[model samples]
Target: STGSATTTPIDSLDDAYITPVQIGTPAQTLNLDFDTGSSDLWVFSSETTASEVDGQTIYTPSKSTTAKLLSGATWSISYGDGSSSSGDVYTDTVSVGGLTVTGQAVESAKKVSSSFTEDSTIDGLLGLAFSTLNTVSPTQQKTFFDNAKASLDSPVFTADLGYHAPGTYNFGFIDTTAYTGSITYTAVSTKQGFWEWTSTGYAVGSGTFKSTSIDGIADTGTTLLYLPATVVSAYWAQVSGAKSSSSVGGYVFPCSATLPSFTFGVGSARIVIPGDYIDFGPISTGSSSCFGGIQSSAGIGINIFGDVALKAAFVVFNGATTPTLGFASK
Candidate 1:
C-alpha cells in the first residue's frame, strides 16, 4: 500500500524527514524516504545505535552477506546552509517496491550526530534530486534515478506534497491518467543542476511592480523563495495596501486581500504563480504587516524558488528519464 507521513526538520541543517511509503512485497518489505535533493539511497545497519533507528527501519548488513563496502571510497556532504554529514560508500543488492536492483551503491553515514539520528523517522533516504549533489565527493557518485533510469518504465519521477498532508513521491511514468495531460518540460541550461527560471516581472493584484529580467533557481532543498532587496521592495510597492518593515531580518507585509499574481518563464514554459500564495497569509514579511513569498535572502543570491513555488505545480524530474524537467499546474 502507498504509505503516508509528514516532512519535518530536526536541525538547522534543513535536513527534513518524512515518513516513507513501504515498497516491495506484501511479505518482506522495505520503507524508503524518497528525497529529490540528493541522489543516494542508504539504510542503517544493525551496527548503528538504537537511537539512530528510533523511528526508522533498520537493516542488518549481516543479513545481506553480499553487501560490499567500497574501499578507498569514503565521502562527505556539506550543504550551502553549512550543515554537514559524512559516511563511506557501499555497493550491494537492495530492493524497493518489490523491485530489486543489483549493484546499487549507497552511502552509510558513519558520522551522524545531533538530531539527524535523533529526530529522523525513517532509517534511510533515497535521494532522487541529482547525482551531482551527492555528498561523497572524491569520485562522481551515482543517484538512484541515475542507476534506475535505463530500466524505468517511463524514466520520469513526480513529487506531490500536501500541506500538513500526505506527501507522494512516484517514479517511472507520471500517471497521466490521473494528471492533466502529457507533461510539458523545460530544457536544461548550461548551468549546474539548479532549476533556473526567468521571471519577466512581478505584480500584486492589479498593481504592476517592475518588469525586469530576473533569474530564479528552483531548489527543492530550500523551503522558501528568496528575492533580491530591489525585487522585494518593488513588489511591496505594488501591494501598496501594506507597508514594509523588518521581520526576521527581512521585510514583512501583512494584508488579507488576494495579493498580486506573478507570471514567469521557467525555461520556456511560461507559468503564473497565483495569488493564493498571498492569500495563504502574510507572505511579504512586514515589521509593519506581512504575507509570504517576498522574503529577504540576506545577500544569498538573486532569487531562489523554494517549495513555495514548487508546491503550486507538478514537477517532473526528467534528468534520468529525458535529461530535462517538466512542470504543470495541479
Candidate 2:
C-alpha cells in the first residue's frame, strides 16, 4: 500500500517543513518534521517537563490502548548544534498520510532542548534515516520508514519539497506526474546512516559545468545547502557584494544583488536552483545584506544537500538492501 501527506512550510524562510502525523490508537495528531538526516521518531509527550511544554501537542501514552511501553528501553539524541532530546520508549500505532505502522517505536520526550521548546511549529521529528542510526539505548529500533517498507508496494518513498507553498511526501511509490523529465537514480551509502550520494558536477548561473564529485547527504531536516568551500566561494564570487563575514555569520550579500542560479548534476540530469532561492532575505530587519542559501561545509567535515537543494527536485529514497537515491526535476 502507498501513502501520501502534505508538508507545510514554517518560519519566514521555510526553515523546516511540518507534516501531519497520527500516533496512538484513537489517534493523536501532531505536526512533525520528517527528517531524512536522523533515525528517531520522537515527540513532545505528557511526561515532558512542564517548563518545556510550549504551544505544542503532547502524545499521552495513557490515553491510547494500543500504546505499549517498550520497557527497559530509552533514547537520547543530540544534534550538531548541541540541541538534544531524550525520553522513554513506547511502541504505538503511528500513521503518516494513509499508511499505518502498528508497532512503530515512538520516543516520548522527558527532556528537550530549549531551542525546540521555543519553536512551537513542530511537535517532534519523524526520522526517515536508516534503522542503523536509531539511537535507542540497549535495544535499538527501526525508523518509521524501515518499519513500513515491507508493507509498501515498493521499498521506496518520495519527497517533493516546496519553495513557498505546501509540499508532499509519498510512501511506497513514485508519482510520475509530480515531476518533469526522466528520473536520475544513483547508488546510496547507508554506512553513514544517511541518504549519502555524490553529485557529479555543478554549474553557476549560465556558466559552464565543472566536473567534480561532491559527496553529501540529502538532509531534509537541514535549512541550507552546504558544499565545499571552493564551490561555495565560486558561487558567492558571482554576486556583486557577497562576502564570507564573521560579523553577520557565514556568507552575506547585498539584498538587491542580482544572484546567479546554482545547478547540480546527477548522471545526465541537471537540477537548477533559481537565483532568488539563494537570496535568504535580509540579514536583519532593514538590513541591506541578505544571508546566502549556500555555505561552506568545511566546518562539519561533510557536505549537505539540504532543503535548499531538495526543494529543486523530486527525491526518492529507495530502501533496498543496497539503498539507492533518485532525483528528478519538478
Candidate 3:
C-alpha cells in the first residue's frame, strides 16, 4: 500500500515508527509498521542495498522455512514524501504474540528508499485497513489481514492506538476493556480497500469553514489531515499569527492560550483533536506556538481524515462482512 499525501510536511518524524507485538509460545516477534495507506505487508531483505535500507529493520523471509513466494508478482509503493519501495511477493508463517498466522503474504524488496533503509525501527508495514486502490494486483497476491483472517477464530480486528501511547493492533479479536460500551462498526461502502466518508463540517480555532460540510474519507495510512483551501485559510485566520511555513507546508499558526478545539462530525460521532497536535512548534514568529493541523496538500481534491481523526474514537473497519467503517467510543 502507498502512503497518503499528508498535509503536514516535514523532513522526518523522530516519533514515527512501527510497533512490534510478541505473540505465541517461545515467542518470535516481528516489528510491524501500522499503516492505512495501502493494504499489504512488506519487509526489507538482507539482499537490499545498505543505503535504501536506512532506519528500517530487514527481515529475511529465507529465515523461515514456511515462507512462500507467489509466481511473478511485484509491488511498488510511493509515499507522500516521494520515497518508495518495490519488490517480489512472498508468503510466510507470521506469528504475533500468541497468534500464529500462517501462509501470510509478505513483500521481499530488491530496493527500498533511503528513508526506510537505515532505521531498524520496525521491519515493515502491516496495513490493518481496507483498500480502494488494488496496487498489489490479482495474479501475485499477499494481504496482511486477508490471509490472517482465515486463521483467526473470530472476525474481529481492533486498532487501539491513540495519540501519545503505543496502541495495540489486534487481529481476529477485539479488546472488551478498551471501551465502556459495545463496539460499533461502520459497514464498508463496497468500494474496495477504501474508507469513503462525508464530513458535517470543519472547525479550527473558533471559526468554521464556509464550505464547512463536505464529502470526505478517513485514512489510517495517512498521518496528517487534509481539507479545502477556504477551510484552511479560514482556520488559520482565527489564530494570532497564522502563516504558511515551508517546513510544514500550509498555514501554521502560533499556539494560543485560547486555541479552540477543532471538531469534525461523521454522522453522530463528533471527533475532537487535541491542543498539542495543533500547537506543534516550540515558538512561532509571534512569540507563540505553531499547531500540527492545517498543513499543505490542499490542491489534492478530496478532503482526508488521517490519524488524528482515527484516534478520536474506536474505529472499526467491517471488511469481512461489508466494506464499511464504524466509529465508537471507549
Candidate 4:
C-alpha cells in the first residue's frame, strides 16, 4: 500500500520540518528531520550518554522483540554545520505512515555533537537521499524508502513543503489533488546521491533571465537557500542598504527595504521567490538589521535549494530507475 505523512515545520519556520516515525515492535515514536542531503536512519538512543541527551526522545533496542544488533557495525557522520554523530547499528522494523520496512538498519546514537545535543527537540534524522550515501561501516545500509520502494506501486515520492504550515512527504504514490497545474519534470543526475539538477539561469525581479547554468541540490533539511557567492552578492546588491556584515555573518539589510523578487529557471519552468521571504527576519532581537535568507555556499562547494526555495513549489523526488524531478505551482 502507498504511504503518506504530514511534515510539520519547526516553530518560527527557521530550521526544518519534523515527521513522526514508528520504530520497533511496540512502535516507539520519534520526531525526525527528514533530510534529502544525506543518508542513514539514525536516532538518539539509550546508548547515548545521559548528559548528552537533553529533551530529545531516545530509542531503546531492547524494548523491541524484532530489534537485532548488527554486530561490529558502526556509523559516524558529520554535517556541513560541523555537527556530528556516531553510533552502533540495529536492524528493526520501521514504519512511516502506512509504509513499513522490515529489518531496516537503524543507527542508534552513542555520541552526538553539542549542536544536536542542545537542540533537545529533534530525536534523530531520517535520510531520504539515495542508499549509496548510507554511512554504516563495513557494509552500507539501505534507506527506509529504498527498502519499501520494491513493494510500492511506483517508485516515487513527493515533498509538499509550505511556509509556516504543515507540509507532507508522500511515498509510493502522488496525490494529484495536493498540487495545482501540470507537474513540470526535469531529468535528475544522482551521481552525488542528491536530487541534483541544473537551472538555466536566474534573475532579480522582472529582470532578464541569464543563460548561465547552475548546479544545485534540493535539500529539505536546510533552512536557507545557499548559492554561489557571486549570485548571492548580485541579489543583495539590488537592495538598498544591503551589505555583508561580519557580525551578522551574512548580507544584512533594512527589514523595510522594498526587495525585488528572485526567479530561477528549471527547463522552461521558472520558480519565483518572493521578496519578503528573502528578508529572513531581524539579525537579532530589537534590531532593524535583517539577514538575507539567500547566502553563499562558499565553503560547502555546492549550491543548496533549501526550505526557503523548496517551499515555493510542490516537488517530486521520483525514485524510479530514471530518477526524474517534477515541480508544480502549489
Candidate 5:
C-alpha cells in the first residue's frame, strides 16, 4: 500500500499552494490550500449560501454516491488572520496525489468569512496539522495524511515552496532531487498541535547569530514571517529608513532601502532568508513604501515561520514516531 503524491503551487498571491483532491465516490475535485497550521478538510459546498460564495467552486455531496451525512455533526474553524468557516460533515472517499483514504471526514461549509469567500482560487482547505487540531464536533477527525500514513512507505511529507514560482508538496516519500545538501533535523513538539520547534537563535544581517532561543511554528498557510516585537525591531533597526507604522500595522521602509539578510538557527544549523525576500513588495500598489516581511507576532502568541521563511529552504515534515522537521537549502 505504499504510495506518494505531488501538488504544485498556484500563483504568487499569498503564494499558497493548492492541490487537487477528490472527495466522495465518483469524486468531486476540489483545489484546496494545503495548510500545516491547522487540521480539517473543509470545502465550499452546496450548503453555503450563494451570496456568500464569490467565484469559488462549490462541492455538492449529493453528486457523489458514497457521500454520507454524519447526522448532527458539524465543524467551525477560525484562523489567526480572522478568517473563519463553519459547516456540516460527511464521510467519503478522499484522494490526493496517488494516495486514497476511505471514509475520510469532509467538512462542507455552510458559512465562510469574507477572507475565504473572496478567495476564488481555493475551493477549500486541506489541513496537514495533527488530528488533535481538527474542528469536527462530537468526534474528532483525522487529516488525509493521518489516515493515509500507515499505507505510506514512510510517514513523511516534503514541502518545496518556490518564490514567485512553482513548488511541489510530496507525500509518503521524500524526493532526493527536491533539495540540496544534507537535511538538518530538529526535534518537534506536538503539544500545541503544530510543527513547533525551538530555534537556537538568529542573527540580523551578516552579524553573529544570537542565542536567544526562539520558538515558532512552520505554517504554510501564513504568508509572512512573524517574530517577537523585539526581534522585529532589531532587524528593522538595521534598515536606514524603516519605521513601525500605525497605518501599516508593521514596520515599513523605502522600497529602495538596502535590506539585510536574516538567519534563523535550527539545531546546530543555520538557515538564511535572503534580503530580497524580507522586502514583501510595496505596502500598496505603486507605492514606494514596502512592508517588512518579518513582523511582530504579538497577538498570535508564538512566532510563525510562514512562506517567507519556509520558502528559503526545503522542509520535510516527519510524522513517524516523535515528529521532527528537517530543513535544507534548495
Candidate 6:
C-alpha cells in the first residue's frame, strides 16, 4: 500500500515543515515536523510540565483506548545550543495519511525547553532518519517508516517540498509525475544515524562545477544549507556586499544585492537552488542586511544539505533492502 500526506512550510521563511499525523484510537490529530536528521517520534503531551505547555496542543494517552505505557522507557532531545526536551513513552496506534502502524512508540514530552514551547504550530516531531539514532533508552523504538515498511508496496518514501507551497510526502512509492527527467541516485551512509551522503561538489551561478567530493547529510529538519568554509566563502564572494557577520552569526548581505544561484552535484546530475531562496530574510524587522540561506558549517562536524537545498529537488529516501537516496529536479 502507498500513502500520501500534504506537508506545509510552518512559516514564510520555511523554518520548518509540518504534516498531519493521526494518533490513538480516538484519532487525535497533530501537526508534526518530519525530521530526517534524527530518529524519535516524540510529541507534546498532557504529561508535560504545566507551565511548559504554552499554546501547543498536547497528546493525551489517557483518552486513547489503545494507548499502552512503555514502562521504564524514556527519551530526550539535546541540542548543542543548550536547549533540551525529555519525555516518557507509550505504545499507541498511529497513522500518517492512510497508512496505519500499530503499537508504535509514542514518546510523550514531560519537559521541554523555551525554544520548543515558543514554536506554537508544531505539536511534535516525527523522525524519518535511521532508528539507530533513536533517543529512547532501555528499548530503542523503530521509526514509523520502519514499522510500516513491511506492509507497504515498496520500502521507500519520498519528500517533495515546494517553495512556499504545499508539497506531498509519499510513502511506499515514488510518484513519477512529481519530478522531471530521470532520478540520480547516490549511496547513503547511516554511520551516525543520519541520511549522510557525499555529493559530487558544487558551483556558484554559471561558474564551472567544482569537481570535488563533499560529504554532507540530507537533513530535512534543519532550515539552511551548510557547507565547508571554503565553498561557502566562494559562493558569498560572488555577491559584492556579502560578508560573514559576527552579530548575525552567519553570512549576510545587502538585501538589494543581486544574489547568485547555487548548484550542487548528485552523481553526474546537478540541482540548482534559485537566488531568491538564498536571500533569506532581513537581519532585523527593517534591516537592509539579510541572512544567507547558505552558511559555513565550520564548527559542525558534518555539512548539512537542509531545506535550502532539499527544496530545489524531489528527494526520495529509499529505505529498501539497500538504503539509497534519489534526487530529481522538479
Name the runs in model 1 displaced over 4 angstroms. Answer: 1-35, 42-59, 94-100, 113-118, 122-124, 197-202, 206-212, 236-247, 253-263, 267-293, 320-322
Highest lDDT model number: 2
For 175-225, candidate 5 gives per-residue lDDT tens digits of 898888889999899999999988888999988888988899999988889
lDDT by residue for model 4 over 57-158, one digit each (tens)? 999999999999999999999987789999999999999987899999999999999999998779999999898999999999999889999998789888
What TM-score does model 6 achieve against the real structure? 0.98
lDDT tens readout by residue for model 2, 169-237:
999999999999889999898888899999998999999999999999999999899999999999999
lDDT of 3 by residue, 172-257 (tens): 66556665555544434445445666666766644543334665566665666677766666656666677877675566665554
For residue 87, what is the lDDT in candidate 5?
88
Total clashes for model 3: 39
Model 4 stretches astray by more than 4 angstroms: none
Error of 2 at 40 (Å): 0.2
Model 1 lDDT, residue 296, Cα? 60
Q: Write the per-residue lDDT of candidate 6 for residues 1-330, one digit (tens) a residue.
A: 888999999889888899999999899999999989888898999999988877888899999999999999999988534667899999999999999999999999999999889899989999999999899999999999999999999999999997888899999998999999989999999888889999999999999999899999998888899999999999999998889999789999999998889999999999999998887789999999999999999998889999999999999999987799999999
TM values, all candidates: 0.72, 0.98, 0.80, 0.97, 0.96, 0.98
Q: How accurate is candidate 5 locally (lDDT)?
A: 0.88
Candidate 1 lDDT score at position 263? 51
lDDT of 1: 0.56
Candidate lDDT values, in order: 0.56, 0.93, 0.59, 0.89, 0.88, 0.92
* Candidate 6 Cα outliers beyond 4 Å, as residue runs: 80-82
For residue 83, model 1's alpha carbon misses the true position, in angstroms, by 1.8
